[PDB]
Amino acid sequence: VGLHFFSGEFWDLYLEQISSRCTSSKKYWNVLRKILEIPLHSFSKFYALWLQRIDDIMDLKQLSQLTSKDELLKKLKIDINYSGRKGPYLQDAKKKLKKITKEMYMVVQYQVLEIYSIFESKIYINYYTSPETLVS
Amino acid sequence: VSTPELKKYMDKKILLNINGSRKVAGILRGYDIFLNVVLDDAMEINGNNHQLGLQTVIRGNSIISLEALDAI
Amino acid sequence: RPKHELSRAELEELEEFEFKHGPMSLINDAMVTRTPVIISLRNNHKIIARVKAFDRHCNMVLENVKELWTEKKNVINRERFISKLFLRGDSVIVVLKTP
């Protein structure tokens, strides 16, 4: 049922249970990275959690929590073990990850906006009334 | 020293458990500062049934907890 | 008489009077006549020893302890000689004095 359009409460509860039970801080990143590709109705809360968790990073070594190191070295041309002045290095990391998140946000925003403005803004009843009811 | 707060259990059916299994369901008529429990119309419940007289008093040393069987 | 309403700082005299003329007549007789007593404990550790001191908690100092217990599997008796012992009154089942 995890691909439901109005499943914001389910995924908020599941991320709450991961953030409360898990102590490794790895499964939360994985599930939220999965949510950043799913066309949900209440989706911008998960993007806001993603953007404030990128802001809540502490060092470069947590970038392996996002992806693998070879995908960072090939696609973003960035190394984890690059030692030196890591201030603007981490700032450029945040800017490039914010650009990738913004592009995927445009994709998911176009999908959700299309589904809402064409289809989901018309259906007013989503429940089982009775065998005697009438639907317009 | 302090009187225990069993005022909400005044006219309600409770179920004491005794030491791992002896579930005595009764009606709490009174208590002390020692958790000695006075029960009217007691009933032993086993996982069978056994009646325990009209009134009874139960020592607070063997009393572990008590379930409020009736709504408050 | 209630315990809290007797007096202040004179309860030790009543405790000594109960020691001299109460159930403590056997622990008093063993420490002044140095006779050996047999204390049976709550885990089959029977102690043959002489009493050195008395306590309100029946905490007893024992000298030349010969203790004995029985392992039941098959049936063996294991003993041990301990020079000095301070026994707690929690473990004591009973105290027997020989004439």
Next chain:
Amino acid sequence: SALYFQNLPSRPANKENYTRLLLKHINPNNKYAINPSLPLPHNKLLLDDQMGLLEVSISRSSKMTNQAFLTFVTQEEADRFLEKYTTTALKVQGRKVRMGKARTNSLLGLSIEMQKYNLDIKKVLKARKLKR
């Protein structure tokens, strides 16, 4: 039969703990390395470890704080050591060690070879000349 080990970790303050660490890092699952609180046997002028590793020797002198020495049963165990590793950096606490054949063998090596005690007297005389 002494081997000079260079680029070793500097400051564990106890000597026998560094001995346990070195016998742990030579070979895993050793008899004396897996069990702490074991009395270390002293060998005067008893096999202590497998692969011929007899004992070690460190010091707290300020000139050679890092490097130390090790001694074996005979030259065949040292040749087996250098034929088993064969220019390969064996791992310790954080660093890569380097081994070599020392220009002066151990005094325990003199105890092994001469019993197949004058050099100890010569070293006492050299220490007497240096302390004067």
Next chain:
Amino acid sequence: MKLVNFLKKLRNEQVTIELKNGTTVWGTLQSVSPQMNAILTDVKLTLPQSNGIAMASLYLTGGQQNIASLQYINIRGNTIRQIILPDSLNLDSLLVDQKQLNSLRRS
């Protein structure tokens, strides 16, 4: 007339303690509460010839590698079954009971 004050005069005494679980504890006394909560250092404790609860209590204290060597153990009063004093100590001088002597002089 509590004999915990007798154990308060037994600092730096190298004793053993048999507990009610069955464990023998060899160590030196540091201090003892008047509720007989005794602390010990330089301790080795052993469960002799069984009780699996006592074996769990023996192993799950850190420092096993069945003699377990521990640096510092506090022991509650109700878990103390008996305590064996060294025979070299003189019981005639440590049991003088100066509080009982002052109580007898106050009478």
Next chain:
Amino acid sequence: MNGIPVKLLNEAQGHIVSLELTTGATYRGKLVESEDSMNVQLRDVIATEPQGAVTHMDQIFVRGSQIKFIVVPDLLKNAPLFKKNSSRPMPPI
């Protein structure tokens, strides 16, 4: 007199706590009203017997001597009972 732990148990009234009994039954629920004798009353109680099964009581009241421990929430990690040098603003005569 009372002491710090009974004041901490009286501090977390109206919060989701988890008890364990001496038999092995673990309770979990909202603390109604704790006392100095630790005879504590819980509400919306979920219970786990030592046999293993899980049940639900509505309004439990356990005696203080049959409690192994109780877990308070983590925001009571920082409490003024834990302050060692908190002075006292002029106690009355």
Next chain:
Amino acid sequence: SKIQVAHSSRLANLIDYKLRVLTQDGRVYIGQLMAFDKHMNLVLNECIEERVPKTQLDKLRPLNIKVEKRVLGLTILRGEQILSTVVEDKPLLSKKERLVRDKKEKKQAQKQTKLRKEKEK
């Protein structure tokens, strides 16, 4: 575990140490004490409760032992069903840093009493 617990310390001096307290069952609680009383009721921060199973007990009887660890967090344990307590791990900050922190707490408490005296006037 080469911690070298203090040779003349008591429960007022062992505060904020990562204890490893043993009970009558053997259910060992590991955590920092922050308070005690006359009955030795111990609050335990970041506490974990470890046990051994019944099948592991046969292997423990005369190697690796798979203990069962549950996480309790901040708990408050009673002094009736406990047996012994030891000191397992030292805390984060040192004795001099705790001394500077206690002096800062004393100065902050004196400033708070001066603020209460200023608000009372």
Next chain:
Amino acid sequence: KAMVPPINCIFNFLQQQTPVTIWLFEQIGIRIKGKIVGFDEFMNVVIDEAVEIPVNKGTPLGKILLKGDNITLITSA
């Protein structure tokens, strides 16, 4: 109705002189039947005409000062 404290409950139970079933500790302990004649503040209950029956052939016992620390439950048979 009202509140009936356990000391006055045992006091009315003493006045009425009903037949008494006194329970005790578990499987080692033996259920006693008798009639109450005296008690105190530590619940050391004195009973008469005592017949003991084990947990599921009773033997007479006479007059008994049963101590407090083993008393579990009191009923009127």
Next chain:
Amino acid sequence: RYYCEYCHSYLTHDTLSVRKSHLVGKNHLRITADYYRNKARDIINKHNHKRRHIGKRGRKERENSSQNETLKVTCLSNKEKRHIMHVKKMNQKELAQTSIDTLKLLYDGSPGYSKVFVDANRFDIGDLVKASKLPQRANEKSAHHSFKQTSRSRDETCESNPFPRLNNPKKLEPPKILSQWSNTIPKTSIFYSVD
């Protein structure tokens, strides 16, 4: 004697009826809630950074790192970083306080809306709602609000409101978007929507 560590108020000999009444009064509630909020805010806002460990780096790492490039550091003034961090703090607290409430307003005309979603006829936690009403012993707290209660009883059946479209519903809320990334919305819609 009894001393409240929160309210900094003393008391007479320790009576349970007085101590129970002390934890109900509004001043103790305000001081306790503010103290818990400030201690939680302090343990969140305390940036316990790691103590740095700088070692003498390798030679070839220095010839590789000092020849690749030199990056540009961005930095802002005091009022700019203060305003940005204040906006980030209000965004973090409004994300910590919010929750998705689409299932409550999306099943509003359901026949079992008065048995689960009403939160007062709930079975397991409805007695907790009916127990502490905060009985408003002040007359101003009862005379302040003059709106309707709209308390939906459990006994509401399917006979009431048979056709959910004739009784005027609400159009559902649009999927909210981030205001910082609102400039990339498709400005041209697919279909013509009026009003």
Next chain:
RNA sequence: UUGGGGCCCUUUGUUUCUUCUGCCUGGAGAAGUUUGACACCAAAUUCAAAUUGGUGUUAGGGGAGCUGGGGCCUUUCAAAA
């Protein structure tokens, strides 16, 4: 005062004592510091604003003066061989 070389800038609010200006072609400037000041939370007064209750910070290094203590050397007195 200038210039060169080496390291660090995670100080992630780019020094974190605070406020203001301001920064990677740089690492800065001005003011203040325990009956005070700074930042924040919560509220009814129907924007903002103002009032009340609390929370946390007011730091680190070096130098002149004063003082306590530890070790060595020198001068003088008393005592013992």
Next chain:
RNA sequence: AUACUUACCUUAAGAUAUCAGAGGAGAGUCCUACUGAUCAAACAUGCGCUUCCAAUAGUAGAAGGACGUUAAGCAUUUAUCAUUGAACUAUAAUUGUUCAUUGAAGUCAUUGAUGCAAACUCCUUGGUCACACACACAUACGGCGCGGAAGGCGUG
């Protein structure tokens, strides 16, 4: 914030280390900026003392875990009783075999539970420090650098 009403309550005591001697106060008790000894606390202080403090001449590793993955890994073990009907082994409250009506509770879990074993990844901690890449030792190791963390002993 002032002024007033209402609800509850209005307090277990004694003392602040021990021993010996001298003096004072009308056998017993109290005091001495009275004297000697022991012990406790605080602040300094030293013992060639005891333990620990992570490569950078590399892309590592020590301690504690994962409430992380491979992993539904491999090997084992359980997943309700009673009455009756059509046959029935049968000392049981027909237990055993196939099918069903009915009766009381009826952990989820069998991708479950226990044991065994390897590999990978990630978290918290440090002096990631000052000189040098060096030929010492039977009285087995010049512990004779600046410190920090824990502890022992000794002095004021």
Next chain:
RNA sequence: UGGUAUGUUC
């Protein structure tokens, strides 16, 4: 000789 909490008016 008092304390805690609550409700009105300035």
